[PDB]
Structure formats: structure tokens, C-alpha cells
Amino acid sequence: VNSFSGYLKLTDNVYIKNADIVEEAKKVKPTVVVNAANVYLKHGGGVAGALNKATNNAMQVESDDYIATNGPLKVGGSCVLSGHNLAKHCLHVVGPNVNKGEDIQLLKSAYENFNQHEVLLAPLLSAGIFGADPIHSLRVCVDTVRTNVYLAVFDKNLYDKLVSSFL
Ligand SMILES: O=C(O)C[C@@H](NC(=O)c1cccc2ncnn12)c1ccc(F)cc1F
Numbered sequence: 001v002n003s004f005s006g007y008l009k010l011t012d013n014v015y016i017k018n019a020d021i022v023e024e025a026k027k028v029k030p031t032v033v034v035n036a037a038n039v040y041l042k043h044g045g046g047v048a049g050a051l052n053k054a055t056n057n058a059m060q061v062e063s064d065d066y067i068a069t070n071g072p073l074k075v076g077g078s079c080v081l082s083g084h085n086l087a088k089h090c091l092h093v094v095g096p097n098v099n100k101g102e103d104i105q106l107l108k109s110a111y112e113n114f115n116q117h118e119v120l121l122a123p124l125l126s127a128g129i130f131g132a133d134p135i136h137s138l139r140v141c142v143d144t145v146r147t148n149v150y151l152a153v154f155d156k157n158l159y160d161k162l163v164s165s166f167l
Helices: 021-028 046-054 058-070 104-116 134-144 156-165
Strands: 014-018 032-036 078-082 089-093 119-122 148-153
Touching: 014 134, 014 156, 021 046, 021 119, 021 148, 032 046, 046 058, 058 078, 089 104, 104 134, 134 148, 134 156, 148 156
Parallel strands: 014 148, 032 089, 032 119, 119 148
Antiparallel strands: 078 089
């Protein structure tokens, strides 16, 4: 038993809600919150900009030190950093950004990172301003992640569309 509330059960392990991931994090303080990052950990907009703003830019400061030491992530890759005031840890996951011309096949690899954590609060990878088909992303999530994932979908119309079309 965990402390997530009001989530629609989709499969044995995936749950979904129309909510802001920052507010869910502030309420639940999960072990792991997922950021929809880019390879440079430059947290400008969407999920990343919102999470970073909620940490008062501490996420960005930590991220810049990570990149200075380790270099960029791979598309499809991830790193574990602090969750600051929002969670114990933040799993920064790089899904493909279709608006950058990145390869959508890498979405499955991106979701595989979730399997290293027993429970996660996460956004829908590569949705929104990342330019991928959100129905497809949800299918890949359910068909790839085996650990317990709680998805927070920000856009109400998107949430309604995802629920109504889910197989
Ligand atoms: O509407 C959506 O859920 C899709 C969209 N979400 C957000 O931008 C967002 C902004 C602030 C709080 C918040 N909580 C949950 N999502 N979310 C999105 C997802 C992945 C991505 F890589 C880029 C995106 F733009």
C-alpha cells in the first residue's frame, strides 16, 4: 500500500491521473519522481521547467555540476539525482524529442529506465512539447514498464483523450 490517491488503474502496474506532477510530488513525496529531461539537463519548459522551478533552481544547479563532470546523457538514457524538496530522488529520463528530429524508436529504451525502480511518479514520456503521439507513448509505457508507475498527466483534454482511447 502506498499514498497515491485518485488514480485510474490501467493495468496490473500502471495508474493514471489528471494532475500536475509537481503537486503530486509535493503531496506524496515519492521515492522517485521522473523528469522528462533533455541530454544536457537544461530544464527549460514542460515537465523539466516546472520541476526545476519548484526546486527554486536547485535542480538546475545540481544538473550543471553533473554535466560538467560526466557529459551529456544519451537519448533513451537516464541518471539519478536528488529529488530536492519534491521526492527522495529524481530520475532524469531522456525520451526522444520529435520536434528536434530525434528517433521515436528510442522511446522504449527510455521507459526501460523505469524498471530499475520499484515505484515511480512520472509524466508521459515524449508527450506535449516533445512532439510525439501521446497515445503511442502510453502504449509503450504499459508494454515496457513492469514496476509500479503512477502517471500524472497535466493537460485535462489530453487525459480525457488518453483514458477514452486506451486499449
Ligand atoms: O500535459 C502533459 O501531461 C504532457 C506534458 N506535460 C507537461 O509539460 C507538464 C508540465 C507541468 C507539470 C506536469 N505534470 C505532468 N505533466 N506536466 C509533457 C510531458 C512530457 C514531456 F517530455 C513534455 C511535456 F510537455
